[PDB]
């Protein structure tokens with residue numbers, strides 16, 4: 001009933017242990033975490049041999065730093081953070097196109113594009129732990145960042161993610177009230193709305209800021225075809241996201257964008273950024289072009305302020 | 309290739325005609341309408357024997373009154389209005405509980421409750437044609453009203469309707485800008501919105517004004533559980549509509565309500581109104597109780613104004 005397993009508590013040294021398939025990991029080790037999860041209540045699985053679990057021998061006052069350093073009220077948070085940081089360190093982050101991409105491993109797509117896109121944005125987080133990493137990530141010590149990206153998103157190493165939904169969780173912890181967007185929709189009746197923070201910088205429906213500024217079609221109204229348009233946006237960038245579609249990107253049209261090529265929950269994120277000429281990144285790789293044409297789910301535009 | 313069919317152009321006199329199954333109704337009669345529809349492009353169906361079609365021998369300047377009298381830019385509108393008014397007259401509207409219900413015929417449910425509920429509301433339409441009928445409907449000459457209710461909703465005699473979706477089309481033509489509602493939703497980010505007219509008096513989500521005023525749970529936020537609540541409502545009544553659910557009605561709690569007992573698009577609307585004691589109407593019928601307990605999709609509350 002034994003499987004060989006590596007146990008680190010410091011992520012510096014490792015230890016080799018044996019574990020009973022008959023007992024919960026907690027019974028034998030205490031609180032235990034593997035690849036971003038909380039296996040502390042789980043019996044051992046035979047696929048788990050040859051893996052490195054992060055064990056955290058419990059503590060009642062580590063919550064000093066917890067809500068402080070990490071801005072979370074999850075007892076599990078650090079156990080998930082660290083057991084991912086083990087793996088995350090094993091990835092290779094090379095600086096490419098000036099930014100810092102992630103050699104594909106354990107399904108990095110979303111994390112690459114998320115990280116490829118969070119350099120280029122004017123954003124400062126309200127949890128110190130992110131600040132450090134972001135800047136370790138710009139220089140190249142990004143393993144701390146992807147680990148927190150996982151833990152904030154509640155994701156596991158190797159679990160596919162949607163780039164859009166991931167940032168929702170990172171943007172909850174950043175400079176929010178500083179930002180403002182206003183929109184009005186109109187047939188019979190009419191409706192104007194203002195959103196603060198993350199709400200204000202994220203849109204689901206079109207990839208074109210211009211259309212949002214021009215015209216964009218919305219339901220109920222009374223029947224089915226109102227128009228909604230942007231009235232005011234007070235924020236440093238904008239994210240425009242739609243179900244993946246074919247789209248046109250030109251230099252200076254857009255900050256950056258990322259290209260999803262697959263089915264609903266099975267696809268491939270590829271990040272494009274606009275510099276000298278368009279620069280497309282896929283893991284370590286890169287293609288640079290003066291035209292694009294592909295399938296995009298997300299486009300990025302820098303912006304100062306706009307009033308209608 | 310002949311079926312016997314009755315042709316009125318004045319809805320006073322009838323004529324008996326024969327029609328070729330080989331030709332479109334227009335080829336033989338001109339523009340032709342049956343039971344609220346525009347059969348003028350359709351070949352005859354053999355079920356159509358023994359029916360009374362409304363024929364409108366075309367006209368280019370009847371649009372004088374059209375957008376005027378009826379507030380529509382449908383050439384078909386009057387042809388649909390009148391061919392329904394034929395049938396609608398054949399129904400029996402008895403005044404019950406003080407209001408005026410509709411003896412069940414051709415699936416009246418929604419029209420009964422809609423009509424049972426549009427007496428009790430403080431609303432004045434912006435098309436004269438409705439004004440007349442509404443008041444013919446309060447006295448009992450309601451056939452003109454249900455006919456327009458059909459034509460405004462684009463429904464046919466005998467086609468089941470959702471009470472909620474029907475009023476959307478009648479409320480497009482009523483006192484709108486006079487009314488105002490404001491709502492704010494809040495996790496990370498926050499969002500406040502104002503709606504004008506019909507938008508402002510109709511809600512989909514709960515049956516309880518009180519909850520809307522108390523608390524009501526809404527998605528995205530960042531994750532999935534914001535709270536939205538009512539800030540200001542400036543209007544004469546309120547409609548609260550939800551997918552049909554079990555609900556509690558007490559006298560003086562609510563203006564009126566209607567009870568849907570069936571599957572999604574196959575069910576039964578039953579209207580309840582609060583007077584001396586609760587008064588439930590089903591076609592001509594009526595039960596009056598001091599308690600209720602049933603399945604409701606729509607509840608009505610009179611209101612003057614409210615500020616948070």
Ligand SMILES: *[C@H](CC(=O)Nc1cccnc1)C(=O)NNC(=O)CCc1ccccc1C(=O)N[C@H](C)Cc1cccc2ccccc12
Pocket residue numbers: 104106107108109110111159160161162163165242243244260262263264265266267268269297
């Ligand atoms: C990595 C994929 C990968 O590893 N590719 C390989 C590289 C090298 C070698 N082999 C393979 C990855 O992270 N993929 N992410 C992923 O699948 C996430 C999809 C997902 C997950 C959760 C929620 C939503 C989604 C999602 O649908 N995302 C796409 C971009 C949005 C989308 C797609 C299709 C239809 C649709 C409709 C409406 C809204 C979005 C939408």
Ligand SMILES: *[C@H](CC(=O)Nc1cccnc1)C(=O)NNC(=O)CCc1ccccc1C(=O)N[C@H](C)Cc1cccc2ccccc12
Pocket residue numbers: 412414415416417418419467468469470471473550551552568570571572573574575576577605
């Ligand atoms: C009449 C039914 C009838 O004739 N009953 C009889 C009387 C005497 C003798 N025999 C029979 C009628 O008009 N029924 N209306 C109807 O079926 C309309 C349903 C409908 C139609 C179009 C769009 C929506 C709907 C609808 O679903 N309405 C219900 C009230 C809302 C509902 C119901 C179930 C689930 C659900 C979920 C979400 C939102 C609404 C919702």
